[PDB]
Design a protein around this ligand. Structure first.
Ligand SMILES: Nc1ncnc2c1ncn2[C@@H]1O[C@H](COP(=O)(O)OP(=O)(O)OP(=O)(O)O)[C@@H](O)[C@H]1O
Ligand SMILES: [Mg+2]
Lengths: 50, 464, 514, 36
């Protein structure tokens, strides 16, 4: 589900892709966008954050 | 879903697009340079897909001032140029923007510069002679109406003068439409051609497309295609006989070579691009004439280092029906139009097309000139006095024949002061038959220099 | 006209069925300048035929662990990153059959002359083995080119590989078109042991030039046994690379079926250039003149298909006439050196000889045929035996043309004989001579019957004399053709007719020849 | 979707001087300077 979500809205994919920016910022962006909601499984959320 | 410039290296610009919006090859992209002194809209042409949603493009305008990260928007179609009877009488650049009247054809029908050559089913050979009025051309390298003609030459041997003379001799009376593609030539001569055509009222029937050498490699690549697109429209959508002058078609391959290493291609022999033959073949094959639709194309070809073995002229030779070949050796000897009579050739110079008399005279002239070329080594050391009597007479014949192939062309009035001359084909054949047979051995050789005709020969002989 | 306009489509609709077969897919990751890199296709094989979405075709030519670099066969601009590439499980193959006679086909066997489809008898892979040493036979049958110079000095025997090599506009395509035209008499016999089927492979020529060659063959009646495998300059580098192999495959199908084939590559220099372009675009290491290491192999692998098969394989033969353009008469260049090494002999055409009026312009002496007399009929072998020595002596004596009074009688006679032999070997274009006419013509010169004719009239004296013999004394020609030798009674009859003709011949200078 | 709003919010925190990284023989490679 997260893979198909990130396939759409390639701007979000590019923002997450940039590793020049600090990793914490990308993780926070992902949490606010994808994994910060109750529907995300704990293991899947941890894998996405990593 | 616009792109973004990632890598700029001279004329080559790499653009990263979103995954689903990578433009097709040969598409036109628009970047913007915002620096005030060089502000412009920069047209790139997608040349390679390089992967990771990157494309590599050849810039049409100079990239000076372009900034990494600038938005690049895809036009969705290749570079398009205006077409129609509106283009006649106006000066365009490679991008189809009118110069003598900016914004003129913006509303005309627009055709892509890229299109496949006419199918082999629609091609038939052309075997109709085009009388130019130049003795050497009409005799030894007869041009083909609807065929492909070239004026090979080194650097500064008179290609531009001769192509202008051919515009003066073929187009002035031509009933159809002319197209002149200045591909990386000198801008001064382009303006000279423009004013000459304007003064002679030929401009109304001529479309000029200029991509002169001040421009970067992209324009010097695509301007020939831009002009050939107008020529093809006149050929196909209107059926008018078309003249297509190009000067200089070598600049197309040279621009391809200039961008070759920046596109990542490994250089071929003599530093040319590996795709020399295919790239030039597409363009040359678009110039052919299809049955019932004639394009009489004349292409000034530049020979680097005066070396006719160079890959570019050598590969271009296969694409031509008539090939006049100017040489610096003949130019040094004062002969103008500077044609090498031996190296030049024409496919219509057969007894079945030009007639047995013309063919015999041309072949006898070539025979005499070849024997003279073989003897020149002996004469320079052992002296003329040591030659055979027959060979001595032949040498005297050959000097006069070489000087008689010289002619005072109209476009070369500012090279010689005297006005130009036109020699009918019949008179050329008669005069050269007389020379090769001997009727003029008593006249001084300087009487044959820059005269153009038998009457002029008699007058100059009397003046001597 | 007919109901077929619908019926054919009906046959398609009733017969069409796109079944669901498993397929391995790659994705185009790079694309540029005629080369497309395809990620995936794990089971693709070298030189496989990949099919791209827009009906485009490519040849899997570089195989790495990352990508398959494929040369695209036309319509390259339609290839994009991310496109799906399907592998056809077939290495490069072309259709072959007798239906290709009189057709112009692109290097894939598809017609481009605008006529109907071609009914292919079979398909042949372009990279099949050439006949092995054990499978061949000695070249012993002439392939009459119709050019007196070639048939007398450097004979081409079917099964041979003769290189027409020379600079531009020297007469090469003329020589090969004349050779193709000369086979019409053999074709009209209906005997497969005599019929020669021609394949004119045009590489890198402009479309109008191929059209001109096709016209020259049609007006000469040669198109009913000739196929033109055309890769015009407009075509991708892949087609220019494949065209010789296409033509060789079409010829090989006939060759293994007992027929005799004549393959003209025009030119192989452009074949080499296309291969160089492909190799450099695939980043294969370059060598001399930037050609890849295996460019020699490219030509060798080709020319060695041209062989004469043993009687166990039907006895068919394929004759190669590669044409090479030498820049500034530099036969020491890379490709000229390679193909001179590969081929069995060389007709060197020179522009100097062409301008002297020695056209067809074979530089005799430098020109050689390693098959030699085995490729000549006995009549030509005996008649043209002294021709080479006479021409060599003439070229040695040419410096003495101005002092004929001061030379020995034998030397002056040799000079006079040589000038007339040189005039004798001249020949108009698109006018090949049957072997009997060549035998009689060379008999005129070598036996001294031209020694009385003026040099400037030799060309006419021959032309009329044959025109006389054919019309009135055809028994000589019939004897030479049916028996292959110039019998003593036939020789006496020929001498008598020559002498009778001499009396009625008007020299251009007004003098009498007897 | 709410992803756009989160991206915009992150963008709020996600002279121009570069630094020479390689130099020699008249050529200098400069890291940084995004707007050069
Ligand atoms: N035997 C001949 N007699 C007279 N003219 C000839 C003869 N052979 C060739 N020519 C003429 O010489 C010119 C060159 O002929 P051809 O087209 O065969 O040359 P080529 O060597 O194949 O060169 P290209 O590279 O242009 O294909 C043509 O005008 C042809 O008519
Ligand atoms: Mg040729």
């Amino acid at each position: 589900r997260f893979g198909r979500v990130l396939d759409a809205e390639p701007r979000l994919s590019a923002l997450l892709s940039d590793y020049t920016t600090p990793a914490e910022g990308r993780v926070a962006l992902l949490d606010k966008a994808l994994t910060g909601r109750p529907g995300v499984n704990q293991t899947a959320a941890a894998l996405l954050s990593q | 879903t616009a792109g973004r410039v990632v890598r700029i290296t001279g004329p080559v610009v790499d653009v990263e697009f979103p995954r689903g919006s990578v433009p097709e090859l040969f598409n036109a992209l628009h970047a913007e340079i915002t620096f005030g002194a060089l502000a412009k809209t920069l047209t790139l042409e997608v040349a390679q897909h390089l992967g990771d949603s990157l494309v590599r493009c050849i810039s049409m305008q100079p990239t000076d001032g372009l900034v990494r990260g600038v938005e690049v928007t895809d036009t969705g179609a290749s570079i398009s140029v205006p077409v129609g009877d509106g283009v006649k009488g106006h000066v365009f650049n490679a991008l189809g923007d009118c110069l003598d009247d900016p914004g003129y054809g913006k509303d005309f029908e627009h055709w892509s510069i890229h299109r496949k050559p006419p199918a082999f089913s629609d091609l038939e050979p052309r075997t109709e002679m085009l009388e130019t009025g130049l003795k050497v051309v009409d005799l030894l390298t007869p041009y083909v109406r609807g065929g492909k003609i070239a004026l090979f030459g080194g650097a500064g041997v008179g290609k531009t003068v001769l192509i202008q003379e051919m515009i003066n001799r073929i187009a002035r009376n031509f009933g159809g439409t002319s197209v002149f593609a200045g591909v990386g030539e000198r801008t001064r001569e382009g303006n000279d051609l423009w004013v000459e055509l304007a003064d002679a009222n030929v401009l109304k029937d001529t479309a000029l497309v200029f991509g002169q050498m001040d421009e970067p490699p992209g324009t010097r690549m695509r301007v020939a295609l831009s002009a050939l697109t107008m020529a093809e429209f006149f050929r196909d959508e209107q059926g008018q006989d078309v003249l297509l002058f190009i000067d200089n078609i070598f600049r197309f391959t040279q621009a391809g070579s200039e961008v070759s290493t920046l596109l990542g291609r490994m250089p071929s022999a003599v530093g040319y691009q590996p795709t020399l033959a295919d790239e030039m073949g597409e363009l040359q094959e678009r110039i052919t004439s299809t049955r019932g639709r004639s394009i009489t194309s004349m292409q000034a070809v530049y020979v680097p280092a005066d070396d006719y073995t160079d890959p570019a002229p050598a590969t271009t030779f296969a694409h031509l029906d008539a090939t006049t070949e100017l040489s610096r050796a003949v130019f040094s000897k004062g002969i103008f139009p500077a044609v090498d009579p031996l190296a030049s050739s024409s496919t219509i110079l057969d007894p079945a097309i030009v007639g047995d008399e013309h063919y015999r005279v041309a072949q006898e002239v070539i025979r005499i000139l070849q024997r003279y070329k073989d003897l020149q080594d002996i004469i320079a050391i052992l002296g003329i006095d040591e030659l055979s009597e027959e060979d001595k007479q032949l040498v005297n014949r050959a000097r006069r024949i070489e000087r008689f192939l010289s002619q005072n062309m109209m476009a070369a009035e500012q090279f010689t002061g005297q006005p130009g001359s036109t020699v009918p084909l019949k008179e050329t054949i008669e005069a050269f038959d007389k020379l090769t047979k001997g009727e003029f051995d008593h006249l001084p050789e300087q009487a044959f220099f820059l005269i153009g005709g038998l009457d002029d020969l008699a007058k100059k002989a009397e003046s001597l | 006209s007919a109901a077929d306009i619908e019926g054919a489509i009906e046959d398609y609709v009733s017969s069409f069925s796109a079944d669901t077969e498993r397929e391995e897919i790659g994705t185009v990751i790079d694309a540029g300048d005629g080369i497309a890199h395809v990620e995936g296709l794990p089971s693709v094989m070298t030189q496989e035929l990949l099919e791209f979405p827009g009906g485009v075709l490519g040849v899997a030519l570089n195989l790495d662990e990352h990508s398959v670099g494929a040369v695209i066969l036309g319509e390259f601009e339609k290839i994009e990153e991310g496109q799906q590439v399907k592998r056809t499980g077939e290495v490069l193959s072309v259709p072959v059959g007798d239906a290709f006679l009189g057709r112009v086909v692109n290097p894939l066997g598809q017609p481009i002359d605008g006529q109907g489809d071609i009914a292919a008898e079979t398909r042949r892979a372009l990279e099949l083995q050439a006949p092995s040493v054990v499978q061949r036979q000695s070249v012993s049958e002439p392939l009459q080119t119709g050019i007196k110079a070639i048939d007398a000095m450097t004979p081409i025997g079917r099964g041979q590989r003769q290189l027409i090599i020379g600079d531009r506009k020297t007469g090469k395509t003329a020589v090969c078109v004349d050779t193709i035209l000369n086979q019409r008499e053999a074709w009209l016999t209906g005997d497969p042991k005599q019929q020669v089927r021609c394949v004119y492979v045009a590489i890198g020529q402009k479309g109008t030039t191929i059209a001109s060659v096709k016209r020259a063959l049609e007006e000469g009646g040669a198109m009913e046994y000739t196929t033109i495998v055309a890769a015009p300059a407009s075509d991708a580098a892949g087609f220019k690379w494949l065209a010789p192999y296409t033509g060789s495959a079409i010829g090989q199908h006939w060759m293994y079926n007992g027929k005799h084939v004549l393959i003209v590559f025009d030119d192989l220099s452009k074949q080499a250039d296309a291969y160089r372009a492909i190799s450099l675009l695939l980043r294969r290491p370059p060598g001399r003149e930037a050609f890849p290491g295996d460019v020699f192999y490219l030509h060798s692998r080709l020319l060695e298909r041209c062989a004469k098969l043993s009687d166990e394989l039907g006895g068919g033969s394929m004759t190669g006439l590669p044409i090479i353009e030498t820049k500034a008469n530099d036969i020491s260049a890379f490709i000229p050196t390679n193909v001179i090494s590969i081929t069995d002999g060389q007709c060197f055409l020179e522009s100097d000889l062409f301008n002297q009026g020695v056209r067809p312009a074979i530089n005799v002496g430098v020109s050689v045929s390693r098959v030699g007399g085995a490729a000549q009929i006995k009549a030509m072998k005996e008649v043209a035996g002294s021709l080479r020595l006479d021409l060599s002596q003439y070229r040695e004596l040419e410096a003495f043309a101005a002092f004929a009074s001061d030379l020995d009688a034998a030397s002056k006679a040799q000079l006079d004989r040589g000038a007339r032999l040189v005039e004798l070997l001249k020949q108009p274009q698109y006018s090949p001579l049957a072997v009997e006419e060549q035998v009689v013509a060379i008999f005129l010169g070598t036996q001294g019957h031209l020694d009385s004719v003026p040099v400037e009239d030799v060309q006419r004296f021959e032309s009329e004399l044959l025109e006389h013999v054919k019309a009135s004394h055809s028994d000589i020609f019939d004897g030479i053709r049916e028996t292959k030798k110039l019998s003593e009674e036939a020789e006496e009859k020929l001498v008598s007719v020559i002498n009778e003709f001499k009396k009625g011949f008007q020299a251009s200078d007004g003098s009498s020849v007897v």
